[PDB]
Design a protein around this ligand. Structure first.
Ligand SMILES: COCCNC(=O)COc1ccc(F)cc1
Lengths: 237, 300
């Protein structure tokens, strides 16, 4: 069934799986019209599909033209997500197709189950984890490619840069979720933390800075502090 | 008016005939049921005093032969049998009627309940769900499973209802994934009403047969079947006006007839609230909604 703290290590076994987050698929700015009413203007989004073992990120860019002339966009977004995920599975060689797809929001189960009726051996699963993948648009390079897109487009990333050369996928995933949790709770501080030291750069083919192991620990610590902090400022503790 | 004679009543049992029922005591001098209206299917059903486990019964049409009930003490149930000897059978019935050992099917002349619950129910059609073709009558009990339940184990004793599954390739046209799942009109109309059922009468027939098996036997797979069939229609944006109107009538009499005390198990809260309040047809079941709200407002 669902995915939680008890079966947490299944993410890093050798059964191919993908997380799908649809939280940045349909994105709008809300504004006042000349008549003083409110209207939304859609901006480009993305489906965040991530292999948690390898770090391969299939960033499908959702161009605002997909919404043109459509009603009930928040509902369509789930079905467009599902369609793009099933197209991705179908584009992949059989030996690369996932055995499980884990959706981060339960509203995706039915749209995806229906789009994947052709793949009855792929388990569609929810999770009880509160994963921070919505903050994926706080990663500058990901945000940039999404906002610049002029047409639908798939962009492939490794969200773990070269980390797997030095650490395990369990550890890489824990770092990523701590980075993203931080960026979600206080983007400015999180980003300040990541770039304070100009001498640490982001390689052109990476998303995150080129930290040593020792620097990562300092970074990871600083991000925990921020998360605990914001938790105080929020609850006054 | 036809007659189902009983050889005898060796064990204490509650006997049902359609929506009527009465208590027979162990070895009471009871020799069956008379004045059964011709022109409808009927169901005679049993719950033993000693083991309310296993309600069971027989669907039959008196136009299709002379049928009698005889307790079998080896198998331990009241068995429907066919008498092929016409004169043997008239003679048996006349003696039992003269000695007045038969109860009268007790139909009030104002009463269309049975007709309204069985309008589309036909034994010849029923015999293709309960497959047992050496008999003209059909046995059902509380425990028989459906063909779809066995997919998710003895196929001979199954209820071969039409398998309806909303998340199936049958239900969902490639490329209309969202359209067909939110608006099941293509599944209801093209696949179901048109490719398997052929007309609404046939679709309504199985819906009716499912309900009755649910109510009389508490057959859980029939309840799912009855419910599935309602949900497919309630979830279709495009339904012929005459089907909606007929559906409202059908459900109305089904809701009317359900025992008040069995509503908690036989009615699916999700399906009804969706059908009456969220679905495309939320506005098209005026009679069904009025009786549901006045008799089971709890469920909603
Ligand atoms: C062959 O596909 C399945 C057959 N379709 C039907 O509609 C027949 O259903 C029934 C069943 C029982 C009835 F009292 C009336 C009708």
């Amino acid at each position: 069934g669902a995915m939680n703290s008890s079966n947490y290590a299944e993410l890093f076994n050798n059964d191919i799986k993908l997380f799908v987050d649809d939280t940045n698929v349909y994105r709008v700015t809300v504004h006042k019209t000349f008549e003083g009413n409110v209207a939304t203007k859609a901006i480009n989004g993305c489906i965040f599909t991530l292999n948690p073992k390898t770090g391969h990120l299939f960033l499908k860019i959702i161009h605002t033209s997909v919404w043109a002339g459509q009603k009930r966009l928040s509902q369509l977004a789930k079905w467009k997500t599902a369609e793009e995920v099933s197209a991705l599975v179908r584009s992949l060689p059989k030996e690369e197709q996932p055995k499980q797809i884990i959706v981060t929001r339960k509203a995706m189960l039915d749209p995806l189950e229906v789009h994947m009726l052709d793949f009855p051996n792929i388990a569609i699963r929810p999770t009880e984890l509160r994963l921070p993948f919505s903050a994926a648009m706080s990663i500058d390079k990901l945000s940039d490619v999404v906002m610049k897109a002029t047409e639908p487009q798939m962009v492939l990333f490794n969200i773990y840069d070269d980390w797997l050369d030095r650490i395990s996928s369990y550890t890489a995933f824990s770092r990523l979720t701590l980075l993203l949790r931080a960026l979600k709770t206080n983007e400015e501080s999180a980003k300040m933390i990541l770039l304070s030291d100009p001498t640490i750069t982001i390689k052109s083919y990476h998303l995150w800075p080129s930290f040593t192991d020792e620097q990562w620990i300092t970074i990871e610590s600083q991000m925990r502090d921020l998360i605990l902090t914001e938790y105080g400022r929020k609850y006054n503790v | 008016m036809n007659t189902v004679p009983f050889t005898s009543a060796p064990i204490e049992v509650t006997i049902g005939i359609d929506q009527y029922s009465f208590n027979v005591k162990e070895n009471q001098p009871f020799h069956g049921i008379k004045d059964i209206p011709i022109g409808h299917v009927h169901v005679i059903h049993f719950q033993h005093a000693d083991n309310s486990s296993m309600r069971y019964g027989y669907w039959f049409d008196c136009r299709m032969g002379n049928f009698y009930i005889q307790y079998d003490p080896k198998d331990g149930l009241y068995k429907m049998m066919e008498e092929r000897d016409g004169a043997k059978f008239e003679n048996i019935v006349h003696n039992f009627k003269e000695r007045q050992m038969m109860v009268s099917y007790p139909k009030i002349d104002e009463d269309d309940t049975w007709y309204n619950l069985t309008e589309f129910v036909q034994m010849d059609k029923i015999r293709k769900i309960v497959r047992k073709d050496e008999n003209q009558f059909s046995y059902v009990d509380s425990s028989m499973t459906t063909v779809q339940e066995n997919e998710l184990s003895d196929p001979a004793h199954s209820l071969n209802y039409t398998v309806i599954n909303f998340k199936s390739r049958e239900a969902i046209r490639p490329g209309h994934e969202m359209e067909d799942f939110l608006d099941k009109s293509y599944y209801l109309n093209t696949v179901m009403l048109q490719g398997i059922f052929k007309n609404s009468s046939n679709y309504f027939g199985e819906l009716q047969f499912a309900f009755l098996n649910a109510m009389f036997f508490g057959n859980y797979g029939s309840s799912l079947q009855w419910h599935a069939m309602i949900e497919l229609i309630c979830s279709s944006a495009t339904v012929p006006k005459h089907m909606l109107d007929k559906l409202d009538e059908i459900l109305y009499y089904q809701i009317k007839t359900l025992p008040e005390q069995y509503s908690d198990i036989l009615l699916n809260e999700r399906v009804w609230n969706i059908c009456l309040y969220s679905s495309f047809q939320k506005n098209s079941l005026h009679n069904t909604e009025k009786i549901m709200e006045n008799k089971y407002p709890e469920l909603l």
